[PDB]
Amino acid sequence: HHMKLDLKILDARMRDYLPKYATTGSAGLDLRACLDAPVTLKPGDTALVPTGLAIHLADPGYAALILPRSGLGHKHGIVLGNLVGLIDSDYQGELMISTWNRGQTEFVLNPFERLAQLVIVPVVQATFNIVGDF
Amino acid sequence: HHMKLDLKILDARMRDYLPKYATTGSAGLDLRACLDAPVTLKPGDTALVPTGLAIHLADPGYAALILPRSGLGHKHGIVLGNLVGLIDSDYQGELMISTWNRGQTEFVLNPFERLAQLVIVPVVQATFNIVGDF
Amino acid sequence: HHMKLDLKILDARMRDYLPKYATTGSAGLDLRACLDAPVTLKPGDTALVPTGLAIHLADPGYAALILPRSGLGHKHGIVLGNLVGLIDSDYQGELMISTWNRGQTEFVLNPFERLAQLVIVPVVQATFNIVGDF
Secondary structure (H helix, E strand, O other): OOOEEEEOEEEEEEHHOOOOOOOOOOOOEEEEOOOOOOOOEEEOEEEEEEEEEEEEEEOOOOOEEEOOOHHHHHOEEEEOOOOOOOEOOOOEEEEEEEEEOOOOOEEEEOHHHHHHHEEEEOOOEEEEEEEEOO | EEEEEEEEEHHHHHHHHHOOOOOOOOOEEEOOOOOOOOEOOOOOOEEEEEEEEEOOOOOOEEEEEEEOOOHHHHHHHHOOOOOOEEEOOOOOOOOOOOOOOOOOOOOOEEOOOOEEEEEEOOOEEEEEOOOOOO | OOOEEEEOOOOOHHHOOOOOOOOOOOOEEEEEHHHHHOOOOOOOEEEEEEEEEEEOOOOOOOOEEEOOOOHHHHHHHHEOOOOHHHEOOOOEEEEEEEEEEEOOOEEEOOOOEEEEEEEEEEEEEEEEOOOOOO
16 A cells, blocks of 8 residues: 655755655665764674654554664674654654664764665454453 | 454453554564563563453464564563564464563562563465475 | 466475465565575574575555564574565565574574464555655
């Protein structure tokens, strides 16, 4: 499916770096580091990296998952400190990336570097029914 | 969407700590540690933490993902040892959280502390079709 | 739901080891290591492990998530170096598993060992709408 997704550009430099689907078959949008200067990430360290963007999914039938990038993660050990992020339909603040160096090699994160992937999935809100036995 | 979700309270202390959606726009349910006493997690260690709860999704068109919490993960390095848990529609045992300290700071997990997020997503069962070329 | 999923067997040894849903209620398919010989993974190391298989989801309304296995991850610290893999509907290359030993114990990965889980989920492609305020 498609969905109209409201996007606020919090940092004007990101007008030139908006997330884009690579192909019509792509599942994810790439989120980039909105940084004034490169950030060095030592092995084991975590940085909170702004994206310069906010979204409003709005429809409670959907959420977004934020995932590491395959190359950064596999090749450089640059992943997410919370592993996978969950963006609620009513979350309207800046998207921030918990960036964790899970490997053994110091890495320099560049301004505007693609850092994570955003995937929009349907979700269900359960209504619990307490039972003694299933 | 909404779904009727059968829930068994395996440990009576959890009647006062049932998972709840924070808002009508929330995607996830918070799962809590069902513990008699605090558990200290040294850097690198993994503990299997009970929730005191079991669910039965029942509908094979759905599954649950269990994710780290953003604050615990980012700020304290308390995440999941299997990274992301997948709960099958027919899994009816106690939900257990593989809790891993991925950081460098010893952490004390409290009884009833929110430890993970549960998100219900639709899933598809594929029927493979072996081909020589796509 | 169900979906016809084209599958190319890139390595003939995998004809005897095709992924299979354990039960009609299972959400995930197990992906196995297609290896000539066991691979030793020291703590902290990452290996790129072939599956001997390629899929073509084809429908841009779906994607696959590749997750660690719960037992391997929890008990042995054998997880994914990119944490969670995202397979796009138009990705038709060999499925490769970034295999990372996140724990403190050396592990030997066996030929044909189940290494990851593949889950097919619906996804949405957003059309951004830039707004000044939500």
